[PDB]
């Protein structure tokens, strides 16, 4: 399966996931591809703030679904 993640900096990125993958897995996959620590990552799909523990199927995220990534980094 293939999903997309778009950033506020105009970046679009293609992940390869599974409906049973947790948001955490996705966050790790984003770390592995973009070098961003998961604790600095907020993921959003369909106006929802996705939780680390739930899965991709739980949010009906499926083929060619686009996720939104926003970082923290407050100092």
């Amino acid at each position: 399966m293939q999903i997309f993640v778009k950033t506020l900096t105009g970046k679009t990125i293609t992940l390869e996931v599974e409906p049973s993958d947790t948001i955490e897995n996705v966050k790790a996959k984003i770390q592995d591809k973009e070098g961003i620590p998961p604790d600095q990552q907020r993921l959003i799909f369909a106006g929802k703030q996705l939780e680390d523990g739930r899965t991709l199927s739980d949010y009906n995220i499926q083929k060619e679904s686009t996720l939104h990534l926003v970082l923290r980094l407050r100092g």
């Binding site: 600095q40 106006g47 970082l71 407050r74 100092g75």
Partner: protein
């Protein structure tokens, strides 16, 4: 000469040095750090306002979920001197000034890049988890260009510096 703990050799040439340029530890250090890199003349008011403006002026990109807060609230909130800037501010400021901004993340030993594929020029700010500083070469150059050979030597220097700073306990973090 022997480098200070806040300095790092760049490349093998031995002529060039990367170093922390510390900024005021108040609540607006992210803005001090960016302002130093780009304007070298402190501004915070102007920087806060441009963020707040862009947010108000595009409620579609910066909608309430993205912002974790109602579009109007965040626009007001980020105008307060006690509000900590973060990734959302960096993104906007980067766009508006057509300069990429790279966060050298000490705790992670990573470099988180903003708009690196839209703008070839970038600055480096140093993030210790609760505070931002600026990074300069030879204490005079703050804007680099990712298409030059020097650039990789600089990024490599930034990473080692981050690594040294983490080892010596200047990291902190929160999550």
């Amino acid at each position: 000469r022997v480098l200070k703990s806040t300095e790092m050799s760049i490349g093998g040439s031995g002529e060039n040095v990367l170093s922390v340029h510390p900024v005021l530890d108040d609540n607006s250090c992210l803005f001090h750090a960016i302002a130093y890199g780009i304007f070298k003349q402190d501004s915070v008011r102007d920087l806060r306002e441009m963020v707040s403006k862009e947010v108000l002026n595009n409620p579609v990109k910066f909608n309430d979920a993205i912002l974790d807060k109602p579009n109007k609230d965040y626009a007001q909130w980020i105008l307060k001197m006690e509000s900590w800037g973060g990734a959302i501010e960096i993104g906007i400021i980067s766009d508006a000034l057509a300069v990429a901004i790279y966060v050298v993340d000490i705790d992670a030993v990573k470099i988180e890049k903003f708009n690196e594929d839209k703008f070839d020029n970038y600055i480096l700010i140093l993030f210790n988890g609760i505070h931002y500083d600026s990074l300069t070469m030879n204490e005079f150059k703050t804007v680099f260009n990712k298409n030059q050979p020097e650039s990789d030597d600089v990024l490599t220097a930034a990473l080692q510096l981050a690594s040294n700073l983490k080892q010596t306990g200047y990291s902190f973090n929160t999550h």
